[PDB]
From a paper:
The poly-ADP-ribosyltransferase tankyrase (TNKS, [name]) controls a wide range of disease-relevant cellular processes, including WNT–β-catenin signalling, telomere length maintenance, Hippo signalling, DNA damage repair and glucose homeostasis. Notwithstanding, our knowledge of the mechanisms that control tankyrase activity has remained limited. Both catalytic and non-catalytic functions of tankyrase depend on its filamentous polymerization. Here we report the cryo-electron microscopy reconstruction of a filament formed by a minimal active unit of tankyrase, comprising the polymerizing sterile alpha motif (SAM) domain and its adjacent catalytic domain.
[name] SAM–[name] forms a double-helix of antiparallel, left-handed protofilaments. SAM–SAM head-to-tail contacts within each protofilament match those observed in previously determined crystal structures and involve the canonical end-helix and mid-loop surfaces. Interprotofilament contacts involve a distinct surface situated between the end-helix and mid-loop regions. The [name] domains protrude outwards, connected to the SAM domains via an incompletely resolved, partially flexible linker, and decorate the major groove of the SAM double helix. [name] domains extending from one SAM protofilament do not contact each other but alternately intercalate with those extending from the antiparallel protofilament on the opposite side of the major groove. [name] domains engage in alternating [name]–[name] head-to-head and tail-to-tail contacts. The head interface occurs close to the donor site, with main contact areas provided by helix α2, the donor loop (D-loop) atop the NAD+-binding site, the C-terminal portion of the β6–β7 loop and the β8–β9 loop. The tail interface involves reciprocal contacts formed by the α2–β3 loop, strands β3, β5, the β5–β6 loop and helices α1 and α2. The head interactions are highly conserved among tankyrases and induce an allosteric switch in the active site within the catalytic domain to promote catalysis.
Numbering used by the authors:
A (entry chain S), B (entry chain C), C (entry chain D), D (entry chain E), E (entry chain R), F (entry chain Q), ...: 875 to 945, 950 to 977, 986 to 1073, 1081 to 1129, 1136 to 1158
Write the structure that this text describes.
């Protein structure tokens, strides 16, 4: 990194750059190193470590409005083995909750676990808000979901700006307690069959914060939630609608086939 | 205490007993003091602090099977002001969820928040177990409850040994989503009137972990949950049954009158 | 309070209750007192202060999921004197920005400054999110606003669930750069005159975070912001629309008359 | 004040309002009172003082971006007696520096000392900047000045936006070392006599930071100071020009007549 | 350093010079070292640490007019990865704002982030001034900028002394909302072609405080801002002019080619 | 020290001398230690600390006429780096202000900053006197100076007893606005050439308080300043004369060669 | 102490003896402690502190004729470093004032400063008396002195009962303006040589109050000072005589050798 070269040159310690080069220390690494970490890599003199730590302070906290802290954020898909207890529980939900296609079961090919730090922080913050409003009860449920935007949810999170405008209950994000109600939404690319039996179809088994849900029995077209409520529970097979993207987390990614 | 007198006498430091007497240091206090806390109260010599700390170690860790660490645990009822948002949320649930007596609403007198450390630890541990079993979803809901043992639940927690043996779905602990379904269970002490409009009734608004619930539509006399399931959801107004005492937490205590 | 009585009784220190009574120490106060504050009120024994602090820890942190910390949050309206520089600046904006009624100026009666803590925290958190998305630029402006919910905005903040459904650019919150464009939205209660010259009108001069705005030149019915954008800028006098309530803060409350 | 009424009502201490009313405590006064100041006015319970201090903190520091701290800023003109040493020194400068009218001396009526906190802070900050640039030397001199904006300078300070556009050395602020060079700029209101011997003329004896001055000998039209320099020194009787308003302070206000 | 040798010799502690030599303690380091920092490097005797701390006090605070505290001030250019969200946002602005050359897009080679402590401090101080004047509104926008003095801005900040005297709205610093409006100002060094497709052009994406802007529609030649205003917004593609260098901060440095 | 042994022996606390020996506490150190500083070094008993503090009081204040407080006074020369802004400013003055030898520029070897506490106190006290006399204007300027006594000014300050008795304007201390006028006064030690191009000639860049200066155009032989005036400004290249040593401070020490 | 045990036992507060024992509080310490000091050491009850303070009052003030207040009085010799300014001044006097042995200079070994409180109080009281007599002029000088009683003067002050009865001007105390006249009075112990060049001779450089001195030119045998005069000045090298011991103070103690 050339950032650390300029930093060290500005401090006047450009004779430490051989050490910083051989230890592959970058600025984003040097920010989080104290006296112990700096002495481990061979900065023995106290004066040099004092200078480096003060210079890091007068960059991180001295330019807070600049936010110079530009520090590996991404999604990690942790595949589950078919003999794992979590795999069996998710499969049990996926199958037993069946109630489109002419199927009676599914062929679970793989189940993966979505792990994103930033989306988890967003979800937990909104969960805390909803909890504080709803007498310390988030009313959290695990529901299925399909939308054309699946490869993008597991990377950028749910987005209400990509809403399902043409829906029964308005421009929200639609979750189904039954896996059938969610794979009815799918679509076929290659084989023109609607009920294709060789289709590699993907489903999300998300983690939804409902809070105070508005029990609705007819159809409406809400753009946002009704006042005082955080979600919509519509029975025209119940289906749940949220209007804030940060209020659901993509928990699992299920790949399966009609069978 | 006379315990600290024996302890200090055994260590041979019986000249520190004026310090320990004026600072009201007891054994259950001395156990949790290090070098810093012991120097704050005026044990300046390093040898004395070393002796005290070693003697505490050779009592807490040296007799781990004795469990000599006998250290105040109790319920603290925190009254919620009627202008607080949590009070209004619980009241909204209490009222709007109605669907015995010839009433249409309630006269909420006071809502208190139950705070017990030990019961919370039990509940959270069982919640972790149920979560691990149920693919990391506790399936936690807030449901009402009435029982003859109300002043005992808020002090010792729910007990399945005090089960509703003569119940529709067996010997469990019965929770209702509707407040009316729960105050139908009450009983009048002073008046003979069943619908006493001046009765001080108490209701629990608990926090119940259901896990994988068994959807049951008829009556049965289960002693424990059906295999593979953590609770029973019976719709003969839905009513929920748990067969483990540690799987619910008494959250709020509502005192009210029929109105 | 009776909560502190139970707490102190559980610790076994019920002889400190005269101190806690004459100094009007409650639980919400006792939570934030350390050794120093506890000795200031006359708890001289180290054992007693240790016991109180440990008992507070084993209630605040030991039951963190309970959130037992129930601690005066509300709106404080700070009247600005007409000789103040801020009053003159807001008045200059209000007047010079005019471009309904047959008026040319206003009769500014009073300008107040809305001061809420919780709403400010919400606004600043959303500002941080929008800034991180928009290359560290919130794109913040103050714009005028009128809505039937004015005495409710200054107390509970902007709410998109109270959206202007029948608006030009959809169900958002409409802000106008011109004071006239916003006082055209008003409505007379007592007089039948639309242009009542003796009407006490209220106008909000709010602080709005636009982020990356969508320049739209026609009318559409956005339920939420267009993908990738945080607001809508409409020029059918430009008018700005946000679709998230936490993305504006009610800054000033202006009371005026047509003149 | 009503702001303090709302504040105290929010804290729940509205029974202290009689104390706050008889002692005329406002919010801008309550902000700067600690435990001892609050006990001096009769708030004896520690809990109440703790509540007030925490509430003030959660308003001053908890809304720092709001800047709710709206706290007697103005100019105080302190008249100097003619027998004072400072009056004599300023008079000696005024007279001896003569070198329009056909006069030889002045009739000094009164000399006043301008005292403003805000303008002094501005001037000292710019002085620090100029000193740091110019090897810790501000190069500060006391020079005379006349402008149509004299009753405005002593209240709002010097302003380069009110520049002398039609000047010899550009759009700056022109100061002269000789008093005659500065009273040549005056204008006659009542009498038509340009050399009116009964005119109540006002002159400023300011305090100017010249920094690194650009020695010029011909006329030019600098919009701003030349690069690397903080002022212009022109000798076409030398006259000094500054292009920053915050780089001079109105020190004395001299009223006199031609004589 | 030889300064610390004289300092320690004057205090009479010249036997500590081997410690100060092996730890590379210089005066600028010793100034910021207290009791714990001085005991870390092995100054165990209390008398010596007392002497050193007192001598540093009687040098830093005892000669405040000298400002002897001469203490890594410089610019650090932090290169952004093309896959970072901030890079994509700045590139989106750069491209989408196009409306010289015969181009339709740009070829962004690299984007760097300018980080200077002193320039940030200046910018934030002037931002606070402008905010206090303009009813707590800096009116901050990010605009593009090209000037012959680009390699000097990122190191010394904007300077109105290097103004654009030959400009349409006077001698100010010209910023453009559109990137094309700002690269129309460029100039070709090596090729005679003005529209060279192989030229490395640098553009600044600055952070400009506008405050209260004077909407002007014709041309004029202000040297400084119109009275009561902090900037000029001139629409003859709108262009913005500031007359104070401290009122914009170079946020990004964009290197690109025409494509 | 042996003074502290006598002091502690007189107090009767000679059992604390091992502590005072290991911590190298001397009398000049013990004078400045209170209760907390005495407890930090292990004087735990209140009686002993009380005795020590009272004995120190009855030694410093009880013998004020003796002035027994004999406490690191000396000059600290702080070298300036050639890339520093202050170095460049002093160099710019030194070069640009030239107008003996046949040279045109100087070769600046090194610039040092003179830091003496006592001389600064003397200079600032006389500055305050001169300011009070001259209507709160010290009329401070930085001018060059050469004298045979250069290594003595930086250590003992300017002295009018070492006056230039054979001067044009009398027995004063002659400062020059131009560096050439000041280096004409030098003298050659090694080489016989008076214009030796390899001589390390030293110069002072002082900080003089001129106050109210007497403009003289001819020669005179003043022993002291003319009545009512604090200095003499002579133009027979203007040269400034002060007749009081404490009215200038040696700010920098410039070492250079003719080039 | 045992006095404090009796005192506290008489007050009836013998349960405070552990505090008074661990804090090493003695009677001479307890006399000077008020409410603040008594609370700092852990006497929290107001009754106990009131009793202690009243008992101390009824012992110090209630028995004033007893003078029970028997409270570190002694001489503290402070050695001066040979590089100190005061050392150099005293040495300059010591050497330059020469005008027995055949020497020309001295070899100053060490100079010490005598610091006694009681002797200083005596000397200053007599100085004030003599000042009041002699129109507010003590006529104080610093003169040399040798007497067989030097180690006794520095501890008990000058004494006219040890008068030089065999003197030229009577039974007074003889001081000399020249060090030579004072070291002619010496005597050799180890070597038989009166002019022993390796003899450690001690001389006093006192601080004598002469008041109104009687100029004498012949010898006489005054037992006391002549009427109306406070001292005798004799020029038979002038020598000064005082007849009251409290009218001089032994300031420095000079140890030297003939050289
Ligand atoms: Zn297919
Ligand atoms: Zn009843
Ligand atoms: Zn009306
Ligand atoms: Zn007139
Ligand atoms: Zn090219
Ligand atoms: Zn030479
Ligand atoms: Zn001998």
């Amino acid at each position: 990194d050339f950032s650390i070269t300029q930093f060290v040159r500005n401090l006047g310690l450009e004779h430490l750059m051989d050490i910083f080069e051989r230890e592959q220390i970058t600025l984003d690494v040097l920010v989080e190193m104290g006296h112990k970490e700096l002495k481990e890599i061979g900065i023995n003199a106290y004066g040099h470590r004092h200078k480096l730590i003060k210079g890091v302070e007068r960059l991180i906290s001295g330019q807070q409005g600049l936010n110079p802290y530009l520090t590996g954020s991404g999604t990690i898909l942790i595949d589950l083995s078919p003999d794992d207890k979590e795999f069996q529980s998710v499969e049990e939900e996926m199958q037993s909750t069946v109630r489109g296609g002419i199927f009676n079961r599914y062929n679970i090919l793989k189940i993966q676990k979505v792990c994103n730090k930033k989306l988890w922080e967003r979800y937990t913050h909104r969960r805390k808000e909803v909890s504080e409003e709803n007498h310390n009860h988030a009313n959290e449920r695990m529901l299925f979901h399909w939308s054309p935007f699946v490869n993008a949810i597991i990377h950028k999170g749910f987005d209400e700006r990509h809403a399902y405008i043409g829906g029964m209950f308005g421009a929200g994000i639609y979750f189904a307690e039954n896996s059938s109600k969610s794979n009815q939404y799918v679509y076929c690319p290659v084989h023109k069959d609607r009920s294709c039996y060789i289709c590699h179809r993907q489903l999300l088994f998300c983690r939804v914060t409902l809070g105070k849900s508005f029990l609705q029995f007819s159809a409406m077209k809400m753009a946002h939630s009704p006042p005082g409520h955080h979600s919509v529970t519509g029975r025209p097979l119940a289906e749940y609608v949220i209007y804030r993207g940060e209020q659901a987390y993509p928990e699992y990614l299920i790949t399966y086939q009609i069978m």
